Design a binder for these strands. Structure first.
Ligand SMILES: [Zn+2]
Length: 56
DNA sequence: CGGAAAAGTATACTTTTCCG
DNA sequence: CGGAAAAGTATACTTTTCCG
């Protein structure tokens, strides 16, 4: 176990330290940044439709 | 007030390393 | 030398806010 370089929560449902230099222990900083860094992959949107296809 | 897009967190699949 | 297990990586999928 390590720590995030922004969050800091030992109980990480799924880590992301990625042996390199920094240690993004959390899954929030990397995955949430999808839209906050650039154009989030439309892949997650394609399945997102699963909700939008039921009611609209 | 409702729906659409943003957002967020878990999970599913995958990989990398260690040890029998 | 290969299997196993946890971390890694990103999409999946449901909720919420906000504007039409
Ligand atoms: Zn973080």
């Amino acid at each position: 176990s390590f720590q995030c370089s922004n969050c800091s929560v030992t109980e990480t449902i799924r880590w992301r330290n990625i042996r390199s230099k920094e240690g993004i222990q959390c899954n929030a900083c990397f995955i949430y940044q999808r839209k906050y860094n650039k154009t989030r992959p439309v892949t997650a949107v394609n399945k997102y439709q699963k909700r939008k296809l039921k009611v609209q």
